[PDB]
Design a protein around this ligand. Structure first.
Ligand SMILES: Nc1ncnc2c1ncn2[C@@H]1O[C@H](COP(=O)(O)OP(=O)(O)OP(=O)(O)O)[C@@H](O)[C@H]1O
Ligand SMILES: Nc1ncnc2c1ncn2[C@@H]1O[C@H](COP(=O)(O)OP(=O)(O)O)[C@@H](O)[C@H]1O
Ligand SMILES: Nc1ncnc2c1ncn2[C@@H]1O[C@H](COP(=O)(O)OP(=O)(O)O)[C@@H](O)[C@H]1O
Ligand SMILES: [Mg+2]
Ligand SMILES: [Mg+2]
Ligand SMILES: [Mg+2]
Ligand SMILES: [Zn+2]
Lengths: 482, 310, 478, 391, 104
DNA sequence: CGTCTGCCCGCTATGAGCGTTGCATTTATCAGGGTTCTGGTCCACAGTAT
DNA sequence: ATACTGTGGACCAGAACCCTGATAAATGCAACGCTCATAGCGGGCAGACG
């Protein structure tokens, strides 16, 4: 997706003539920088009276199309802007006829007119940063949403070079020290249209060889960010140890510029903290920590939680809906979800989906209770770890999430679909408690009346209970239809 | 392949593969694996061979040879079958048809031999001459390659020589005529030959696959035989009478040659574990020794049927 | 080549407004009940049972063709397919400029022009389930409501609403790549493969040719079926197996559905094991009808069994089902739709000729342990419940069913002996007054009844029937 | 490639009692009726004579391909082929264990590299060889192909797994190189079998002794019965020192390996060179009378006419003209007759005659006039000139 | 020989009907082996199944396909066809075909 | 006695068959954390001398 | 008629292999180069006329 480049002057004087920064969107005046991140699905009033299948589909679609911008995303967005549009000083292509300038300086420094002059352009200070937080707090969607504002590919007409602003990589479930290197090729061959993976990402080369080719690939273009996400899945047994992982991840010096960002759960936080140098360079400039939201940080309860709960409650779609939200519902949401962002939204979605299945068509705190003890078994260690608050237990059990929850959602939707079918014709049959009078029912009305034959046989049986099937038949005509 | 040889009576399928390689002039083992199986990732093993079914597809037009016939009459599975159990036996039968190589070895606890127990090639003094006179060829017979007994059931003892399976892996080797027993006599113990002759009828029996007692019935069988022979006083082992009963048939040196040395001075022993409640399947040798020492007037089929029925 | 002149209708969704490719489809209001309208019944009159045994056998053998009961797993698939097709035409709007131009305009406006910002942001599915669950037959008839080719007259563009592909035994990727044009030319009638599908082109070039014709021609849905028949070793490793499908989905840009077996789930474990909603490959699982639902018997099973039970044609049949006869189906069949109706239809044919004309549980054992032989590994895997055995013993489809059907239809000829019921029917004149005879068989003996009905029908008071039925009974009783 | 499940017979000779291979073959026909067995002719029918022009002209050209006439030497060749293919199975019995000794030896030949190695002393080979050389234009490439049509080539046994190929025919390469016979053999042994021996045994960088013993072993993995080689003249054009190597390998294979070999070559191939059988073109006069064989050949070729007009009886003048224009060679008789018919139908005269035959020859056998005139002159010097002239 | 054997496989995969060779006269006689080599190569094409061929050359290229009985026999086949210039007077009267061609 | 124009033959050029050889290609080798194997343990219990 | 002793069954914990990942190295295999054979060629030598 190669967007043509058009330039605009910037207030900062450190980038007066730098093309790679001016070819980007303007510097975000942080008054509504994260206001565009706010997303909410329409929920038109006409969608209330609708079939159960489509409503269940919308309920399943809620988590994808809902994204509440918090007050802590502003700091992350500002940091991303700073270390993406601050790392391009050493990769400036706006270089004039420097041959004449360098020759003149060389001539003038030797004749005594000048005594010193700088001749070196190898000026590139790489930046690095960790993003550490409990799993389920939204470290991937709340990064893709922010990074989608910046175009990935920008094409210069005058030159023949592109600026890959962001490049996203995710590790596999097992993971290794070579899978990340191959995934860099895999992701860049998908960002642009080329064949880099087959040209450079070969099996024969060693890990250092692909790490060195990464320098050439990321310096041929004006790459600006390299997100390696979910390092928690890296298998330590298949890696080689708990030290050579650090020795590989602190080997980001040999790739020029390219401010690398890493995201992981606190299980890797203890891994990336063994010495001064790795702690300095892996997290070059701070390390933002994501913590679960609390009801109150000051004396007053936090207004962000109240706003999020109100906005999520307004999105509800049911025939019987209560506009007023009782404080007990908020209390049980906090006591059962402890502010973890993933848990609360899935709990609400499952409650709204199960409300259709049970037919109560209302959301109650108790319903939240049985869905909690029914469908959320594997997430328990998170729950008692955060309830106890012990850092050791939290760090030991911070990598687990409920598995295959999408399949459970599909199963619940299928159950709701199968439940719906009811037959008004079968309502007539449903009063036939006795059974084995179904013989006469089937044989008689196939070519006979089907209107009052079904109800009146009930009266015939009840009025004459001391009877069997056979001689009930001969007078059925005169007693019922005639 | 187009002309796959049909195995003879009592021949390992490994020797059939080797003779197929000999017939059509294939010398490099990689070509042999390319043509017989189609892949170069198959490990050659003697006893419990893997990747079966491929060997049967080449014999498709001969309807009499299938997976079950090859697995009961041309391998070393019937020796391990009746003692492991029922579900494990059936799962092993159903798994040897697929491409699992180490799973067959590792699934049966009795077959988990880990390190090979003297895996070199063997033959017999007089069996080779009989085979040459009757067939005109030589092959690795199933009688020769007993798991732990280097004794032909009819002859005195085997004759080991050089080379081993673990040394060269992808090679199917078949004896021809250029090598044979040089004239020297090998000492043989009569008790071991008698044991081998007693146990050899197990590899050719129509009901050898169904007669598989469960895990629980083995201890009940042992208690019933001990009660009827009257050795036990009250759920107790004499620690000397059973040892003397075993010694009346098998001496210490013969058991040492079989690595089944008696440890009557120490509480833990194979016989003591047989007396106790069983945990995993035991080898054929231990069961055969116990049955023969504790009852000398019965054969394998009737004893196994009596154990299974009650 | 089913060409219908395009007509335009208003759709309440504001997203599809002024898109000429979308409103040509059938409207949403009448399509809600369309999927539930696929219910079919081979309804017959009670006089049809009075006919010869060959006629009823020939009507019964059409049950595996005309019988279709929708379930809860069949409405959701139709809704998903409708939504996925309808949402795949929001990009190719001929009345609006290309999305590249819109992105460039948005970048220009987020530049020096006064606006806050613009988002520079840009859905394949697979249907994996147990073999024989009723996938291809369900899709063939849930895609019937959409006309295949809709012709536009204001422009010159043929809208191929959906296309369907089918694989062959031991095929490769090139076979599907060429079968796509084969199906397209069966749809349009042109020569799109007579010169665009030569052997000279490689896989990358051939797919590059695919993408441009898939984008120029209005194409909404591309379904590839029976992927289990594709040979793995002939194509190669499982890595390029997934790579080819990934590059097929990515470059074409149209919604694409795949249908296969769990033996392909191990191929597609990558990109699916990790939750990737942006990449797509959403999974929908089909399972055999679970008889027990939360400790209770399933309503769909007892409704499908009832509907299947009401349509049996036998002489002395037991019209009511028992619990054991229903229970043995789930033990001999495990509930997969392929062999449940197969067991029923084979049981009825065997009961036609073997003995008493009634269906019992015992003869189902004869059928299962005599003729439904080859799929025993799948049944054992399903009974065990082990996912590994279920996955690795799929792909068998018990072939040569047509020869079995014709031979069972022919074999009923060699029956010279007459059961007393039908011989009594034939010796009686066929005035088709025997509806009473079939109605009142149990209560009174045939010896008392049929001679008496002969005597009465010799001088019937009036020609009317089923209005004059009670009077014969009054003569019948005394 | 006619795969047949063999059904066994019981021959009357005790030397052939228990073999499956040689029980599977069809019986040896009596020479009284073997001549009638070989006889084939065009079905003719009289409905063609009242049909259109080009349709009638087309089916005349099928005469050279659908017409065959047995002669005296045909029965001798049939008997000799039967004897030579029945004598080559008495030493490779697989039932009593004799093929397994003729095939274990063939592996140490491949391993060591020399063809003369031997591991079992009692492995005896019984095989024959025979060369068939006759004047070009005699039929020794289609007569052999019609003699070897009774045997169904590939035949599959049941108790064993051998797919016995009865016979195999290969052609010598024009180059005459050593690595071409051992390649077109592997091409002929997988054209008629459906396998790929060439991709195994020829693609690899192999030697010459290895690929000369591999062929001799794969020709005994299948119980091959007769390896017949046509156009043996090509070896004289090979590189220096390569002409004698085949002359020793095709006498070692007959003696050691045991596969019978029959070699057919043009008259030029006497000098480059087992039995010997010589064929000659037919001569109408044996001692002083026109011969019965020639008279019958002409009188039966007569009826294969689709002329709208004809005569009842042949004339001695026309017979003499035909003989003079043919000079006794077999193919030219049929070629001249079909060309004369074609020219008569083209011209519009519906009758054939001696002047018509002469003009047809003169106008339609222009490459052939030099050597036909040489044969007609009969000068010994002119006969010795050129190659493969009858002498 | 390898390519000539691949010719048989290609000509039997597709039912080839007629393989005509023209411009034989444009063959250099010093870059293939000799006249005997040309003759042997063009006779070696008897092994290819069916696929009748037709040979085209100048009357100075007739000398190679001559003096050998088998080579001449395969050269002839269905007779001989000799294109020649239109002579004016085959009979006493000039040929009508020349008159018609000139007038047309 | 020079020299000038046709021959030829050691060359020059090129096709065909075979003999080294660069090359990934595949194979082989070595460090390492985990998981079942196995070993002894002990704890309640059956039979017994006091 | 009971405490003491041996014993059967369920059970922690150290350890020996073992699958696996990363890295270094032997190697068959088409990929060109060698050599042999064969047909032409153009300037040098015998030769013979001015
Ligand atoms: N005895 C015969 N009866 C009938 N036709 C015959 C006879 N002998 C030869 N012919 C015919 O003459 C031709 C002989 O075929 P072909 O050209 O292969 O023979 P050839 O010259 O002996 O063979 P080669 O190619 O080995 O030199 C065929 O057209 C065949 O029909
Ligand atoms: N601000 C937010 N508003 C709504 N949902 C959110 C928000 N942040 C995170 N989520 C939820 O988190 C889920 C994604 O979590 P994920 O990115 O997998 O966590 P991680 O980055 O730790 O892997 C989404 O389903 C989304 O609904
Ligand atoms: N909804 C349904 N109701 C009744 N029978 C069905 C239904 N769906 C499929 N079948 C039966 O299943 C049989 C085989 O289905 P098939 O088309 O093979 O499915 P698949 O292609 O997924 O294996 C058919 O004969 C059909 O009668
Ligand atoms: Mg994450
Ligand atoms: Mg289908
Ligand atoms: Mg010939
Ligand atoms: Zn022996």
């Amino acid at each position: 997706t190669r967007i043509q480049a058009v330039y605009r002057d910037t207030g900062v004087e450190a980038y007066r003539d730098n093309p790679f920064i001016e070819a980007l969107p303007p510097l975000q005046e942080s008054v509504n920088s994260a206001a565009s991140l706010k997303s909410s699905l329409q929920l038109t009033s006409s969608d209330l009276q609708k079939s159960r299948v489509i409503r269940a589909h919308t309920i399943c679609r809620i988590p994808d199309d809902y994204f509440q911008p918090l007050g802590t995303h502003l700091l992350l967005s500002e940091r991303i802007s700073v270390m993406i549009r601050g790392g391009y000083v050493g990769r400036n292509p706006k270089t004039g006829d420097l041959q004449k300038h360098l020759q003149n300086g060389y001539e003038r420094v030797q004749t005594g007119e000048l005594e010193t002059f700088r001749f070196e352009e190898a000026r590139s200070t790489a930046q690095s940063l960790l993003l550490i937080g409990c799993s389920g707090s939204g470290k991937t969607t709340s990064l893709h949403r922010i990074l989608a504002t910046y175009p990935q590919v920008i094409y210069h007409r005058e030159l023949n070079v592109e600026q890959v602003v962001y490049l996203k990589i995710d590790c596999s479930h097992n993971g290794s020290l070579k899978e990340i290197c191959l995934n860099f090729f895999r992701a860049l061959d998908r960002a642009l249209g080329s064949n880099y993976e087959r040209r450079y990402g070969l099996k024969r080369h060693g890990i250092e060889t692909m790490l060195a080719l990464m320098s050439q690939i990321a310096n041929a273009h004006a790459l600006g960010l390299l997100v390696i996400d979910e390092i928690q899945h890296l298998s330590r047994s298949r890696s080689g140890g708990s030290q050579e992982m650090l020795n590989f991840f602190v080997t980001m010096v040999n790739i020029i510029g390219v401010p690398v960002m890493l995201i992981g759960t606190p299980k890797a936080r203890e891994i990336f903290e063994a010495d001064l140098r790795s702690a300095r360079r892996g997290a070059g400039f701070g390390a933002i920590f994501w913590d679960p939201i609390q009801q109150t940080q000051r004396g007053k309860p936090n207004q962000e939680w109240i706003a999020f709960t109100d906005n999520l409650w307004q999105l509800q779609l049911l025939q019987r809906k209560d506009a007023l939200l009782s404080d007990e519902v908020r209390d049980v949401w906090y006591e059962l979800s402890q502010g973890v962002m993933d848990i609360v939204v899935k709990l609400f979605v499952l409650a709204q989906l199960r409300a259709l299945a049970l037919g109560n068509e209302r959301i109650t705190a108790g319903l939240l209770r049985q869905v909690y003890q029914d469908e959320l078994k594997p997430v328990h260690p998170m729950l008692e770890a955060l309830r106890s608050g012990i850092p050791e237990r939290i760090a030991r059990y911070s990598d687990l999430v409920v598995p295959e929850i999408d399949k459970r959602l599909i199963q619940l939707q299928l159950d709701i679909a199968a439940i719906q079918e009811q037959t008004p014709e079968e309502k007539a049959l449903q009063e036939l408690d006795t059974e084995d009078q179904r013989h006469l029912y089937l044989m008689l009305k196939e070519d006979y009346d089907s209107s009052l034959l079904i109800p009146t046989i009930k009266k015939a049986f009840s009025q004459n209970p001391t009877m069997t099937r056979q001689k009930l038949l001969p007078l059925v005509l005169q007693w019922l239809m005639e | 392949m187009r002309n796959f040889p049909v195995p003879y009576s009592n021949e390992l399928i490994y020797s059939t593969i080797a003779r197929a390689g000999v017939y059509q002039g294939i010398v490099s083992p990689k070509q042999l694996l390319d043509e017989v199986y189609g892949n170069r990732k198959v490990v050659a093993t003697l006893g419990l061979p893997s990747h079966l079914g491929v060997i049967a597809r080449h014999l498709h037009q001969t309807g009499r040879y299938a997976v079950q016939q090859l697995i009961y009459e041309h391998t070393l599975f019937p020796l391990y079958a009746p003692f492991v159990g029922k579900e494990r036996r059936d799962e092993a039968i159903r798994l040897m048809e697929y491409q699992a190589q180490g799973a067959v070895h590792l699934m049966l606890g009795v077959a988990a031999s880990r390190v090979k127990s003297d895996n070199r090639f063997r033959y017999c003094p007089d069996c080779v001459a009989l085979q040459l006179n009757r067939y005109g060829e030589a092959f690795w017979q199933r009688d020769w390659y007993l798991p732990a007994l280097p004794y032909c059931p009819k002859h005195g003892a085997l004759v080991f020589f050089d080379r081993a399976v673990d040394d060269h892996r992808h090679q199917f080797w078949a004896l021809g005529h250029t090598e044979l027993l040089s004239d020297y006599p090998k000492d043989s113990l009569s008790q071991l030959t008698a044991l081998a002759a007693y146990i050899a009828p197990l590899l050719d029996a129509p009901r050898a696959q169904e007669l598989s007692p469960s895990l629980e019935q083995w201890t009940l069988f042992y208690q019933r035989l001990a009660q009827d022979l009257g050795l036990t006083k009250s759920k107790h082992i004499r620690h000397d009478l059973v040892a003397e009963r075993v010694r009346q048939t098998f001496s210490d040196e013969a058991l040492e040659k079989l690595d089944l040395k008696l440890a009557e001075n120490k509480d833990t022993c194979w016989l003591k574990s047989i007396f106790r409640k069983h945990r995993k399947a035991f080898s054929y040798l231990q069961h055969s020794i116990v049955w023969q020492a504790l009852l000398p007037k019965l054969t394998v089929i009737e004893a196994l049927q009596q154990a299974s029925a009650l």
